[PDB]
Design a protein around this nucleic acid. Sequence first.
DNA 1: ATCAATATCCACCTGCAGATTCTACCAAAAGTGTATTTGGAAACTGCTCCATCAAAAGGCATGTTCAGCGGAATTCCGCTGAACATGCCTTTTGATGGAGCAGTTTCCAAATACACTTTTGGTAGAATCTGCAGGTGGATATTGAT
DNA 2: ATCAATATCCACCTGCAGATTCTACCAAAAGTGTATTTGGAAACTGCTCCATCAAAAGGCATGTTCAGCGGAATTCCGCTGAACATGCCTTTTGATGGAGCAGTTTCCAAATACACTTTTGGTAGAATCTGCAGGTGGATATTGAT
Lengths: 79, 82, 98, 97, 92, 92, 106, 107
Amino acid sequence: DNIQGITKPAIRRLARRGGAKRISGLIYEETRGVLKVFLENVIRDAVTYTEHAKRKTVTAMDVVYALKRQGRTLYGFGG
Amino acid sequence: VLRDNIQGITKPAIRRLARRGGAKRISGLIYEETRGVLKVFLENVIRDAVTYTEHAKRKTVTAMDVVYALKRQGRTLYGFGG
Amino acid sequence: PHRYRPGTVALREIRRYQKSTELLIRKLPFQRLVREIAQDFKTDLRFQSSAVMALQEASEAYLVALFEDTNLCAIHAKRVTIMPKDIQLARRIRGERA
Amino acid sequence: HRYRPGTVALREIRRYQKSTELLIRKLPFQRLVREIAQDFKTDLRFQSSAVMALQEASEAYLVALFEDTNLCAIHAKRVTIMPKDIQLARRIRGERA
Amino acid sequence: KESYAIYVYKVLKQVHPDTGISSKAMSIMNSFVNDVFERIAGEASRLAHYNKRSTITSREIQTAVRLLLPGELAKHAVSEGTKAVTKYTSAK
Amino acid sequence: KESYAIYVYKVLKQVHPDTGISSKAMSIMNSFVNDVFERIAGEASRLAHYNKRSTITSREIQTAVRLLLPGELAKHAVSEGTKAVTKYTSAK
Amino acid sequence: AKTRSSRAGLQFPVGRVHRLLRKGNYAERVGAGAPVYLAAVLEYLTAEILELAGNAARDNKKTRIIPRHLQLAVRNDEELNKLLGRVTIAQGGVLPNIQSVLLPKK
Amino acid sequence: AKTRSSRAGLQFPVGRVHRLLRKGNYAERVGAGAPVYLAAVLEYLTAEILELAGNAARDNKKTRIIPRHLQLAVRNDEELNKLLGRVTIAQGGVLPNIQSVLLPKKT
DNA sequence: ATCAATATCCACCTGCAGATTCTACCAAAAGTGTATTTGGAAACTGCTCCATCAAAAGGCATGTTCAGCGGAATTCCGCTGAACATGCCTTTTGATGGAGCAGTTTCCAAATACACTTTTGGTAGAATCTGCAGGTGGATATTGAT
DNA sequence: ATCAATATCCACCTGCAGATTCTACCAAAAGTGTATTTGGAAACTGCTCCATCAAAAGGCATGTTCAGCGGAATTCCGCTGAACATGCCTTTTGATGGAGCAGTTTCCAAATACACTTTTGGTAGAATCTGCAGGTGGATATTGAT
């Protein structure tokens, strides 16, 4: 049950960097839900690239390639 | 009478577009806002197409030059080749 | 002396146009606009008919969709009248302004 | 002494907009990755950098999403972001249009 | 000027024997086949590169399909494809 | 494992002589170069196919650059590119 | 001789797909099954859209499938819709849809 | 023997880039001018971003450019920002930016 | 506007980790130099199909009337921010075993490389054919007034 | 509820624009048969680094209290867009030179391919360096109560 590790305080900090001044009480569960779908989709592809390489280890490159497929190119980890 | 080209894209037409888009009531200011948007849209696409044109040393923009441009803008279009 | 109430015909138009597929902008005027915009990129150009057509199909498709997001934004604000602030918001969230 | 509601909020915005550390606790995030992954494929290992790459993208995405959300609330003449706003932004973004 | 039209047409007859298709519609299916072909080819292409392989095999097409198509559509696409490679290999 | 680091560093020293760059930052710059390289090469690749050409020349690279980069960046990338080719074209 | 499409038991041109993979510069080499598999996937998807586009025509009492019939077929199917989420089908129109709040207050 | 980079008056490696163009399979063949031109564009661009990076560095009293500096440089420049409109620079943060309606008082 | 509680700003300071810097080894590159191949500019030209012009045709501009929508003003409940007390779980510094990714040699199934023969999918010009789009008629529903 | 006005639906009709089906010419495929090459998998395994266990302590999450004020429901009015019928300028639709789009033939500058030679960009290892994180204090903003 780890989606709860995404605490209310952290989700708040994130909204802050995002420039939000006041946060509804329902935001938190919604955000956890939004984040879970993001991760599932990024991991599904990453892990797909891992398998194709017949590896048991998901590598940063696997994540960098998955992010690129999804239109969310990431700079900094070899990609 | 003599008006301007973007103005050629008329309110009745813009209203029709908005309708297919499901808009029930249209503010008076929408029409000019739209023209402006449509112009930025065409410039972006045509700029890319004419670039494909010159590259192939032609003087005629081809439906494929437009399809290839649309595809770059992530605005893929089926039906005109490609 | 008959008269339909505000909105009655509009809705009727929505129903009509969401049913059909013809282009809703007049061909010639569009063609002029396309050529005028192009003249700014390279002079003395020619356009296959199919190219101008393709462009119109794309443009209407784009605008119709933008009007949809725009209508959603108008609604978000508890209105039923799309305004520029609405096209503006939509285009920013789409990344066209971002 | 007590600051009026919203003053600290603004203080926090300036604070976090000025910095770059991730804002989600590391270990908890790692567990969420491992859980979602295991549900896709059992017996999997992660290079530490792979987990960090996923965290950098996630928060980058979530922060971008809140700005849009914030703009949607304000579009509603409100200053409080609510679920319906997150939802209007993803529908427009195309994550469920 | 090659096109997938005739094969498109064949497929149409196995599915709806008594149904026809206009030009513009045939032209849309053609755009559709090319588009998917290019998307799958491309992803297979990268797949190989990431793994420093020189060959795009049926394995690459498969993973590409998994990555490109939606869940159920993928499930079938994958079987259909596996079936074609098998029947092909099992035949003189 | 090759990277563009040394070259990034040389250019860094040319513009800001007394500034360094941290490791993570250099990593990012390295991602930047590979990214733009791929995008440009890719545009080139298609451009060539679109014209039934099997050779990617300084010219495909140029049009790709015009399609990919914004206003002034493109305007200048092309000058520097042209410049570099003319000079190389005259050195031998 | 017997065509590869026949052996693979497909309507789509395996020979052409193979050719198109080579001339496309997707890789140095191309295995023998790749064009088979690929061709098989393109036939299947083609069958899916025509199948639905077809039902779309019968539902409108028409026998000849037109663009409208492809648009109504694609956007009314979650997966095909996602697969073509960034594709405009010319002469397709849109699906009939009016936000509730816009309907006359009965 | 003079490197093609020097013949071309460039700092970026003309050969490495000609080589990568081959290995990436973009065409049957790659003309000689292509890598010279592409290395220049890559060089011209890294210079541009580094110019802006170093400034941000200077602006924050730092001598060593770090991610935040690259981000600030990219997001504050219309063109680079567009060129990287769908790129995420790890550890870069966001630009300080607070919507007006959120600031207190009036006037 | 004066005043006190707090946060913000910031130049000074030095331990520590991450950054710059030699020393030598190098096989992987990148370069220099014949031999062979050919991709595509370059000029010539026939045939579309694009631009232009004139008349068969169908929609847009315009003014007025008012109903109903958007937003200003008012109001009140309650939910969300700020502050505080408490305590646990993240993180941090280290160490260890072993998994599995990654280097290296070996060798065969499979892929490139012509060369030759067969068949097939595209184009072209001719004639035949038909799914359906509008046009009509009459019935029935919807809307708006009373 | 009661018509009156219009929009909307449907069953049928039928002309023709566009879809079908025939034929022949054919280069470009695509299949086949042989000779040669090679990518990458199997087998052995060196060695990075991932998982994981332990301990420590304090950065932070959790949970509660309390009320300031933002959200949202309601009333109200002015004004802005919708409907509409009046009338005309524009667009549209069908017909005719010519300008480029391509199809072809040529032949050279330029791109492989192959064999050496030599120069460079990684890096493994140990060593000295240096920018700045993080701690500190105290002087200057910022807030909010009165």
